[PDB]
Design a protein around this ligand. Structure first.
Ligand code: HEM
Length: 116
């Protein structure tokens, strides 16, 4: 669905139309923001350390692994999503690309079914 590109500092460089629909931030609003604006606390507070940690250590926790996370929308409502990260690099700098699958639908069916 969503695609998003950050600099090695977690600043949003690119923001696809999907993500716009997914998160409810227009591309402009979104560009030049910290990516943490898309998650809840406590994650939202740590995200930078998530990044400085990987930079100095080169140990991947999501990169090439993938994970299921809670994402936060603009109007504050949260959701699950599968998150994948790609490391590229341009202008000598490392750039990260997030691909996002919304899982709201699956989680809700699974709840509904559990409930019945
Ligand atoms: C909006 C919801 C998001 C959440 C909740 C989330 C959560 C996380 C978590 C949990 C980690 C490392 C976990 C650990 O240390 O065990 C992480 C690391 C990282 N995330 Fe975020 N993420 C989100 C979106 C994004 C997006 C869209 C990108 C764009 C590329 C991104 C880039 C990164 C990078 C580069 C790392 C370090 C690499 C690694 O840990 O392998 N994140 N994030």
């Amino acid at each position: 669905d969503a695609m998003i590109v950050i600099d090695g500092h977690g600043i949003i460089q690119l923001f696809s139309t999907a993500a716009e629909r997914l998160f409810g931030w227009s591309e402009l609003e979104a560009i030049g923001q910290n990516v943490n604006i898309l998650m809840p606390e406590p994650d939202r507070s740590r995200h930078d350390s998530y990044i400085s940690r990987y930079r100095t250590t080169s140990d991947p926790h999501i990169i090439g692994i993938g994970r299921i996370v809670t994402g936060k929308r603009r109007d504050g409502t949260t959701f699950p999503m599968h998150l994948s990260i790609g490391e590229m690099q341009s202008g000598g700098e490392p750039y990260f690309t997030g691909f996002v699958r919304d899982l709201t639908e699956h989680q809700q069916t699974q709840a509904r079914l559990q409930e019945l």
